[PDB]
Every structure is written in structure tokens, then in C-alpha cells.
């Protein structure tokens, strides 16, 4: 074992593993989105580049485990990162609830991490979760409700100015 | 008595008290919306973030009536802040509408206030309230005048386009 | 249920609205000791600065809830706030000590908060308060103990002169 | 009469004048407790410069009163400045204590004024009286009353360390 490696269960540098997966799969669907909004027959460019943005967030959070994974000792291994569930991501408001599936699930993986670790007693890996990511998680969870809510209100899916509307005003 | 007194009728020093705590009890009730305008299933920030700034004032007011009884040698008696009447407040309209009420109910209340100094011969706390106010409660009165007028000509209500073009460009 | 709701227990969530009219509370027995200090008849004018700002702490603390409480997905419901134990508060001594026993007491709140947030498997709600609330607890709780030494040592409730030393040094 | 006379009643242009040579008495007053805080036997400059403040003050308030006789088109006639009561003021405390029955007996001029204004329906002359005297009144009675609970906290008149201690820290 690594000489740096101490208190790390091996379940956890496991998990790790996958969350890391996990992370990197969010960030390609959200790219994925961007794709979507660019595209000359849907042109919503800053709702296009809002899942831009949200792309390199996710990317980075799994760089950050990478990080983490070395400090503590443990060895990265990669795995394929699966292509997207849509080609084609209908509209403004099917984009944002499939965005909110997509962040309850890394939310789910994350907090069932922190009961893995929990019960292996890691702290640090309990504070890094909290510190690093828990939050962030309800952030942006709560950002895109907002998000879906607003979608509602301006007449979505049938209203297309109400489409426009929200493209101008809330996102940015 | 206070070695500080003079020419402050004890009626008018009772009247101070129940006033402060109409001030706190506005307070609370912007508190309220503030809140529920910030739920994520309403989602309206600008709207939420106006009536934030409500309470704040309310809870000002109130601590200006503290300093003023005490400067005139009075007794600051305080009871009970009395929970707003609803719990949630339906929409922006339902919302500015409670709110007139609210401030028509303070502004009469600051009315009585001035009638009762004014019969008790009391010219200082007439102009306190003149100065502090009764100007300050108008100005907030029609601010809300005009905002309900703007609700409903966007079709409040009906009409969510409307409401979420009402936090966009009403408040901020 | 909340669109935005993940992992976020009801007990849990009535313990938030209970605590957040214990701040409230708090805040409005800081109050009391604000105008308390603040009369012709008492006039230590740094102690009353003193408690206006831990009036304003207490508040900003409950606003906190607030925002948290919708973050979750949860819902904020208020009550009354009640009146201090006390229309008078002694003297700078008396005071410190109920000042004490209530941080104590909201101290002691949020321990138990913290306790079921545990019980209940909430990373997230523990990690806030353990960043938001339960530092600041015990800095506030050392500084009264702190200050409540001085005052004996001033020679309070008997000694005058170590009263008006005390505001004059202590504080500001 | 004067061209410009307007709704100004003779009793008022005479009270005018009575209240004008009573803050010219005022002013000698804290002119006499400049000197008595002065004295090498005494040597409480703090103090003394606290009602060398006052007295101008007092001076611009009569001066002021001028201006207005004239503005209203009546004519400023003056009388004998009588003497301050008192050519040694004992101790700090004793002339707070003086101090304060002076003030309040400006203040009852003051109210009293106005009442007549009231009476003869002038307005003008009741915002004047409002704006540029009576909020300045309780503000320095309420100074004062602060200063004689120090005093007293301080153990005046027999603590002399007290008066030192008041002299270097509540003044300035």
C-alpha cells in the first residue's frame, strides 16, 4: 500500500472511483445540452451556454476527486464515460427537468458516499464531501427548480415566448 | 417619573408602545412574503427581495420609536409580535394587495397617534411623526398603488407570462 | 412534494422552524436590553450598542433559516414571537448573566438539532450548522463569560464606578 | 405696520422678544459654568468647554430668533441680560443639575410659545419652532439627564475620582 495511504478504506477508494464516473458522465450530458440550444433550429444561446458552463463545473468536480483520490492514497481507475440518454433534448423545459434528475442522482451518489464513509469513520472523508460538493449540490439544485417554476409560468412547452422571454431574463 | 419628562402624557407614551409593536408586526409580515416569494415552487426573487427590504424598513421604524420614548423619558413596554395572517400569499398580486392593507392599516394607526398628541398638546411627537413618518407611508402607499395597477393590467391573476415580467422590470 | 426535496427529513424540517423562532426570541430579548441601557435612568450608552448588535446577529441567524428552509425544498412556518421575561434588566451584571443563560439555551437548541439531523442521516443540514451556527455560539458564549468575570471584578452590582469603567473599556 | 407683516399677531412678536432675551440668559448661565470649570481650584476643562459649547449654542438660538422677528416683519426689541443666578457651581453634578432646570425652563418657553402660535393659527411660526428648537431641546435634556445618572453612578458629589473619570471619558 501506499506509504500516504492511512485510514482510506479500500470500499471508499472505490467509490470514489465511480463518483468520479459519475461526474464526468453529468458533464457530457450538460455539453450534450449545449450542443442542443446551438443548433440553428433551436438557437437559445444563453440557455446554450448555461449547460456550457455547467459542463466545466461538473468536469472539474471530477478533477477534484482525481486530487483527492492521490492525496489519500488511493488509484484512480477510469472507465468508459457513457454517451447521453438524448440525441435531441426537446425544449427549454425538458432540458431543465432532465438537468434536475441528473443533479438529484449525483446528489443521491454523493450522500451515499458520505454513509459509506461514514461508517468506515473517515472523517476527512466526510468534511471533504460537505466542504466541497454537498453544498454546491443544493445550489444548483435549487437554481434549476427555480428554473423549471419560471418555465411554467411563461407557458411552457406551447409557448414559444415565453421561451424566448425566459432565455433573456433568467439565465445569465 | 423621569428626571427627563416633560409635557409627554402618559396616553400618548401608551399609544408609542402599541405603535412599536404595529412597526414589528408589519415587520414580521414582509418577513413572510420575503420567504414564500423565495420558495422554489414561486421563485419570484425580485418580487421576495423587495419585501425584504419592507421588513427591514418596518423593523427601523420600529427602533426609532424605541430611541423616541426613551428621549422623551417614556417606558418601552414590549409585548408579543403576532404571527402574519396567512402563511402563504398565493401570488404577487394577492401579495402587493395584502400589503396595501397592511400599510393603510399602520398609516391609521400613525393617524390616531397624531390626532391623540395633537389634543394632548404634544407639538414635538406631532412633528416626529410628521417628519418620520407620515411622508414616508405615503410614498410607500402609492408605490404599491401603482404596482398593484401594473399586476393587473398584465393579467394577474391569469396571466404567469405577466407575473414573471412584473419581477423583471416593477422591482429591483 | 417540493421539486427541489432530497434526503430532508419533516422532523427535521419542524426543528428548523422551531429553531428559527428561538432566534427570533433571542433577538428580541437583545432588544429589550438595547432600550433597557439606552434610558435616562440608566445610560450606558456602549452596553445598549452592544446588545442593538447582538439584537441584529440574532436576527440575521433567523433570516438564515429562513433561506435554508427553502434551499431544502422545505417550508418556512412562522409563530408568534413572545415577549422577554423581563421589562427591566438591572444592571449591566444582570444582564451579561441572562444574556448568558440564553445563548446557552439557543446554544443548547441547536445541539439538539444537530442530534436529530444525525439520527435522521443529514450531512448537509449537520455541516450548516456546524459552519453557520455552533462556531459562533461559542465565541458569543466566551465573551459574556469573559465579560461577566470583569464585572465581578469591577465589583458589580455594589460598585458604580467599575459599572462605568466597565462601558467605558469593555466595549465599543 | 410693515410691509411684510403677515399673519403675525402682535402677542407673538412680543413673546418673540421675551424668548429671545431668554436664551441671552441661557447663554450668560453656561457662560458663568465656562468660567467656574476654569478656576485653578476647579480644573474640569472637559466640562468647562462642554458649556462653553452650550452657552454659544444658546447665543445662536437667540440670535436666530432675531432674524426671524425681522423675516415675519417684527421689530427686535431687547432687554437686560439679568445675571446668572450663582457665581460658583459647587461640583460637576451640581451644575448638571442646574443645567437641566435651565434647559427645561427654555423648553416650557418654548412650548408655551407655541401654543400661542397654535392659538392665533401660524403656522409659520410652529415649523419654525418645531424644526429649529424643540427637537434640539430634548435631544440636550436628554444629554444632560445621561450625564446626572453618571454622576451619580460615579458617586458625585463625594467620589472626586468620579468627577475625574467623568470629566475624561463621558465629555468631549
Redesign the interface.
Known sequence: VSQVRQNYHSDCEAAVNRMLNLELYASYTYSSMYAFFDRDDVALHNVAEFFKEHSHEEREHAEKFMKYQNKRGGRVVLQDIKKPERDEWGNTLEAMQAA?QLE?TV??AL?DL??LA?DKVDPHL?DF???EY??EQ??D??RI??????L????LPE?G??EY?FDK?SVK
Open positions: 434536475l438529484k446528489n443521491q450522500l458520505h454513509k461514514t466526510c464531501l460537505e466542504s454537498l453544498e443544493v445550489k439544485i435549487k427548480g427555480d428554473f423549471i417554476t419560471n411554467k409560468r411563461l407557458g409557448n415566448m415565453g422571454l431574463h
